[PDB]
Amino acid sequence: PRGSMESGFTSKDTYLSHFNPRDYLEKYYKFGSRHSAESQILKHLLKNLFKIFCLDGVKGDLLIDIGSGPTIYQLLSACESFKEIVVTDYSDQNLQELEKWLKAAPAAFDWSPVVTYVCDLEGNRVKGPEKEEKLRQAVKQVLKCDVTQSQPLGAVPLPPADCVLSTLCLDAACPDLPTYCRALRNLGSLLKPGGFLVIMDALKSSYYMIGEQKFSSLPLGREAVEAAVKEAGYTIEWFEVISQSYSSTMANNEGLFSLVARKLSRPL
Amino acid sequence: GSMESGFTSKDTYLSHFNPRDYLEKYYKFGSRHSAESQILKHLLKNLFKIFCLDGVKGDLLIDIGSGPTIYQLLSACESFKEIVVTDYSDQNLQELEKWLKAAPAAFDWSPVVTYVCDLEGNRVKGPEKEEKLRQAVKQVLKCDVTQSQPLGAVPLPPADCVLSTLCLDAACPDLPTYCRALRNLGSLLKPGGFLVIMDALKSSYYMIGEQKFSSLPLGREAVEAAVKEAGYTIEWFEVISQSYSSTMANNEGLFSLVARKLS
Ligand SMILES: O=c1ccc2cccc(-n3nc([C@H]4CCCN(CCC5CCCCC5)C4)[nH]c3=O)c2[nH]1
């Protein structure tokens, strides 16, 4: 026939070549209103992260952020609770954009309003400059991750981490449910026994947009997520769903979830 | 300390390689007799000699590392009923597909199409030539020449010819991988099938505007030894002294070779 074959490309190929860090930041993290859907969701995620790392007992020596993207908002409360942080993504472009903020390059994104907000949550025991530096000192490594591989960070020499965080990544990274489950088990290989898994992601979202550019997403409901996490050797401590969805022009999600789980797996 | 990122050359390539910058900077074929135009002229004549005058012909040709370009196919569609185009970059194949579909955003190849029609004796005008290429190109696939099955587990019939222009140097970070890649491409070929390769000599990088990429700097002796070792018999091998502009690459000439898979 003609054009009757699979191109052979995968989601991660399309992601690596098409995903634009600076656009994603323009569209998802610059707000013309503070009551916009995107702004509301960001604030919610920040409050949960504050609760987990500051109020709940989630702290330690090493945190690994899986699928950081080009953002640092998901690390601002974490750097109070973790000596060292490792940031990762499948896109080197995302990591370059992130590194610009780490090195405080002038072209870096302006996170200062998000910083202010987190300083408020924490009760203004520091101002933004001091907090920003604490994060800059905390981040030690900038690495490729591939959650589909049994060794997501390669054969790199990393000690077992106290926490693996992943915000708005796993849905986009996994083309089917078996992959999702395997990925969660693969992330386990980075963790100490009894270590924390922290996940926030969209529910029932099959796509996300950056301008005219469309990306695939695995549309999971809460039951699928819970089942997959359990089956991958974690015990869920809590699981929150919010109804607040993204604008239809960005995603077709029916809310987001947040969970904190612990690795039961103790490979001898 | 500080660890390595983990990203490979093919990650970097897939991530950063911009089809349209490559087309702008390399294949404009403008008024100024640039080094890039002189090189393009030479490739076109060699391809014509190989496919039209010589007897490299058959049913199936697979182009490895097509990129966003069609210059390497213009003579080949006279000799082959079917052609498969491949690249590790989906961006490249998207730009190529724009041309194949005659979308208006497509690159203007007509100066190059004109040149080739001239070579071939003006048997046809450009539009008919372009239509003949469009009918010939059947599939658009990912390739990864570092894999023992470069086009995946797709059911493809054994090919009569494997073409690869300006690809393998860029695709392979070491000589062992280069040898293996030629071995891998062989899996696509019939015994006695043709392997056509054109690439830069002693080139360690290339520029796509502001973006720099790695390439394997190979001398002619390395290339010939690697091809023999990979299980081919070389019919002929040509070198030209003409290099790219310093602002684009640091090569000491190009090579063309035609080899056959050992029957
Ligand atoms: O480890 C892997 C392996 C394969 C792979 C394939 C595609 C994408 C990613 N992700 N995905 C991300 C993040 C980067 C930042 C943006 N999110 C997507 C955000 C949308 C927002 C709307 C709701 C759905 C999530 C994705 N980082 C990534 O590395 C992959 N990660």
Ligand SMILES: O=c1ccc2cccc(-n3nc([C@H]4CCCN(CCC5CCCCC5)C4)[nH]c3=O)c2[nH]1
């Ligand atoms: O099959 C593979 C597997 C891994 C891999 C990694 C990097 C690059 C490529 N190539 N390389 C190309 C072409 C696409 C079109 C541009 N040329 C580079 C052109 C320069 C010009 C100056 C002289 C050196 C070559 C490269 N297409 C590719 O797919 C790779 N191909």
